């Protein structure tokens, strides 16, 4: 493959001059119209071997272009803040908005390629981060990002001329071979030539910049459900206080140090979400959680692509975040409602499957839960909450307009635990018409899950 | 003072469960409330003698209340992010947005009295922890927080029948907390922002107390000539062609050096760039760029504020973007825009702006204080030199540069910059953060003397360090 690229690459000094005035203002243009258009991001990643021009010529696209449009990051040097969180999240962490360019030194190619040639990671764990680079760069430009990626190459004799490498193009070879895709191309730059190697980036820079901005039943599941099911006085509130007790117990154990822990809540409208969460926080002291009730996304949020706004939120070890409603508003309200299209949501379940196989790699302990009640004791419930004398208990326009779409909203949660309770995240469907049982059914999943995990790490 | 909350308040059982059915069905509502306005933030700070409840309060406050609605944080255990910024950041950085609650433990004040207790500062730097409080405190408050502080106390004796950093069971370290507590909260009870000290020996005394506090004070919240520095510019000065590539060369190459020095380390820089419309503030900081690798610097151009900052207060805009150390941040427009287009369109109110001035003055003492090296430029040009480049630019076919529909007008409101750029010099240009005025009608004399300020700057700043 690489040799391509060994060929001798060169461009002449009056040509590249010329070149580079026009490439510059065309360039500027571009960018300029990026920011206006303010519909996708720029992400250009810089790989390759050491000296083949990758810093100089990340320099020179900053003189060309113009700096205020563009953030350099390098992920040589983690934080704790970093450290302590699945290592994707600090990529998220630094992705541009729309609009905007972000140049990533230090990437995840850069990890996986050095962790492989260093021998901290066998070959079937490179194989997996290959095949991880894949589905979230397919993510990024399926949410609408313009991906270039770069590597600056020299060869063996043309390096050592310059005043590990071997197993590094071998690796290289491989994962360049399984992540060049027609979405997002692997260029392989001759860097010997400082000329041809800038004018070269420069030029599909502008190519794929230009070309970028000129463009425009399923009820089984619920229905098998016993509702019926209810704790008495007495089982109530003695399997309360058990699981109460039992969740301290399990937090304050030293083996949450190694794990932390998400919890998901979604269900019917009345269906007690906000009772079966502060049962679980009636366990803990406030200091223990960070409680994120998700609404309609904010502007910042709106200019990253879709699971950014979840990822930002995502807790450090010994740390647990409860989403009050989640990413799974994706393939539910944004599905039955047209917030998104189609082939957005289609999407959303593996691109969820592959977020939550994440957090669970790193330690993360997921529990989801559905509160399901019958559309009768939904009515019920929307009439009591009327005539408290309580705005909060007030049922909202919308509430209604959901309730209407009841329907929609039971094939859509059956299609999202076909394609998303899986053995390393499965859905937990909570009978809700009797609270309680559904109070001590969420506080036992949680606390079975996190000694689950403990048994898991031996 | 604490005397008062020596007394021994009690409340019986059956009284405060009564009171407590109506209490956080009240709560609840007001949350709520609070929540549809979204119109300010809720900050309580929780302080006081170990063993007086503080934890305990909190979370009952959070079995009465939402807790979907109320973020709870403590800080003392600082993240490497935190330290390598000010020490003001990392409480900026979790200033719960309006409609929200947010509860602080280890706040500044425990930061300050456990210091002072420990010996770890002197009474001079306890002075001044107070101070930078009250001030910080007063912005919040101005801004629109509805700010809590509740001192839970015990007594000596109380305590003495009764995971903190102090040891407690040293009679010492009661007497000098306590001492230094009523240092604090007598010089930062404010009318608009009261200590509260709540008697915490009855647990359902101090609950309903403070829960009872927080309603009342949330149903009620509910319910509601300086252009002689710029006219004796001289204008007219420039660099020719040579001069300019040789000085420009060498100075590009001192920065580069200075950034490189090992000293840096123990430094951060702020570049802050303001000027009139077409006054070349792209084309200064790029050559500043241009001296330095990419990794080396960040460029935030500043605008209308997004969704996320406008539920924030002001100064939150720009705290989430200053430099840890040994990086360089670079404020194309910055937070003097209230006291500039802000003050001339009346996008904020007088008070708004009058009181920036000290504000932005504290911000950048807490900068300098950390090590950050502030520099601050204002390019100036004439007005007829203005128009000379808004044709330029329409000139060229490019369309980045066509002279758009807003700053024909900003230019009839030219005298009206000419009195804030003069008021804004006068009243922050300090010993700390100096303004510089750049001539700027020439554009290479302008960048020349920009690059030069810099690195005078941070030459200044190694002869001050050890």
Not at 112 to 117: C, Q
Not at 120 to 126: G, Q, R, S, V, Y
Not at 400 to 404: I, L, P, S, T, Y
């Given at each position: 493959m690489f040799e391509s690229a060994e060929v001798g690459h060169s461009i002449d000094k009056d040509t590249y001059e010329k070149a580079v005035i026009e490439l510059r203002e065309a360039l500027l243009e571009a960018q300029f119209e990026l920011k206006q258009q303010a519909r996708f991001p720029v992400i250009i990643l810089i790989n390759g071997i050491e000296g083949a021009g990758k810093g100089e010529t990340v320099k020179l696209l900053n003189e060309w272009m113009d700096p205020r449009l563009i953030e350099v990051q390098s992920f040589l040097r983690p934080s704790d803040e970093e450290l302590e969180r699945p290592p994707q999240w600090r990529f998220w962490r630094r992705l541009p908005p729309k609009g905007r360019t972000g140049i990533f030194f230090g990437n995840w190619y850069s990890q996986?390629?050095?962790?492989?040639?260093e021998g901290?990671?066998?070959?079937?764990?490179?194989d997996q981060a290959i095949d991880a680079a894949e589905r979230f760069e397919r993510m990024l430009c399926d949410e609408g990002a313009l991906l270039f990626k770069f590597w600056f190459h020299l060869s063996k004799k043309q390096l050592k001329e310059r005043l590990v490498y071997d197993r590094f193009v071998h690796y290289g070879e491989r994962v360049l071979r399984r992540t060049s895709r027609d979405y997002a191309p692997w260029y392989v730059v001759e860097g010997a030539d400082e000329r041809y190697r800038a004018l070269t980036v420069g030029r599909i820079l502008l190519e794929g910049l230009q070309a970028a901005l000129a463009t425009k039943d399923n009820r089984g599941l619920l229905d098998s459900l016993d509702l019926g099911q209810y704790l008495d006085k007495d089982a109530y509130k003695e399997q309360l206080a058990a699981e109460q007790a039992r969740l301290a117990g399990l937090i304050r154990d030293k083996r949450f140090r190694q794990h932390s822990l998400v919890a998901v809540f979604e269900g019917n409208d009345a269906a007690g979400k906000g009772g079966a969460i502060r049962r679980v926080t009636?366990?803990?002291?406030?200091?223990?959680?960070?409680?994120?009730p998700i609404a309609a996304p904010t502007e910042e949020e709106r200019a990253q692509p879709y699971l950014w706004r979840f990822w930002r939120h995502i807790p450090a070890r010994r740390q647990f975040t409860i989403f009050d409603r989640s990413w799974y508003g994706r393939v539910l309200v944004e599905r039955i409602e047209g917030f998104c299209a189609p082939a957005d949501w289609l999407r959303a379940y593996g691109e969820i499957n592959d977020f939550e196989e994440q957090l669970s790699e790193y330690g993360i302990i997921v529990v989801k839960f559905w509160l399901a009640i019958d559309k009768q004791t939904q009515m019920e419930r929307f009439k009591e909450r009327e005539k408290t004398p309580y705005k909060r208990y007030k049922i909202t326009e919308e509430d209604?307009?959901?309730?209407?779409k009841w329907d929609q909203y039971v094939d859509a949660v059956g299609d999202m635990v076909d394609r998303t309770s899986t053995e390393i995240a499965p859905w937990t469907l909570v009978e809700a018409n009797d609270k309680r049982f559904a109070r001590v059914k969420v506080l036992r999943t949680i606390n079975d899950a996190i000694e689950a995990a403990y048994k898991k790490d031996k």
């Open positions: 996986m390629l050095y962790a492989r040639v901290h990671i066998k070959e079937a764990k490179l009636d366990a803990l002291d406030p200091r223990q959680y960070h409680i994120v209604w307009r959901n309730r209407d």
